[PDB]
Amino acid sequence: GPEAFVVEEEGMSKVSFKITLTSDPRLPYKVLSVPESTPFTAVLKFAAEEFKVPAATSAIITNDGIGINPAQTAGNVFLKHGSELRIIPR
């Protein structure tokens, strides 16, 4: 019967973030894409590499300026915060 048809999961396999270095008034950005299951620590590592800044002294925050727990997936960050993120010194 109809109870036997279930939407078990839904998502998007490729997650894209537009990460802006907002301390620089030219607002340099990178659009980075990663698998949905990518640990967010690896997104910070990728972004720091592309911006040529040390991952250890950098952080990624939401467009609204709030911190993100790194121990979650890229897909979950996108679900909560959308695509626009900022890279800042920590």
Numbering used by the authors: -10 to 79
What did the published study say regarding this structure?
Ubiquitin-fold modifier 1 (UFM1) is a UBL covalently conjugated with intracellular proteins through ufmylation, a reaction analogous to ubiquitylation. Here we identify a UFM1 substrate, NADH-cytochrome b5 reductase 3 (CYB5R3), that localizes on the ER membrane.
To determine which region of UFBP1 is required for the interaction with UFM1, we prepared a deletion series of UFBP1 (M1–M5) and performed a pull-down assay. Analysis of the secondary structure of UFBP1 M4 revealed that the region comprises a coiled-coil motif, a β-strand, and an α-helix, and the β-strand contains FVVEE; overall this structure resembles the UFM1-interacting motifs (UFIMs) of UBA5 and STK38. We crystallized UFM1 in a complex with the UFIM of UFBP1 (aa 194–202) by fusing the UFIM at the N-terminus of UFM1, and determined the crystal structure at a resolution of 1.6 Å. In the crystal, UFBP1 UFIM bound to an adjacent UFM1 in a head-to-tail manner; a single UFM1–UFBP1 UFIM complex is shown in Fig. 4e, left. UFBP1 UFIM has an extended β-conformation and forms an intermolecular, anti-parallel β-sheet with the β2 of UFM1, which is similar to the way that UBA5 UFIM interacts with UFM129 (right). Phe196 and Val198 of UFBP1 UFIM are positioned equivalently to Ile343 and Leu345 of UBA5, respectively, and demonstrate hydrophobic interactions with UFM1, whereas no residue corresponds to UBA5 Trp341. In addition to hydrophobic interactions, UFBP1 Glu199 forms hydrogen bonds with the side chains of Lys3 and Ser22, which likely play an auxiliary role in increasing binding affinity. An in vitro pull-down assay showed that a UFBP1 mutant with point mutations at Phe196 and Val198 (UFBP1F196A V198A) hardly bound to either free UFM1 or ufmylated CYB5R3.
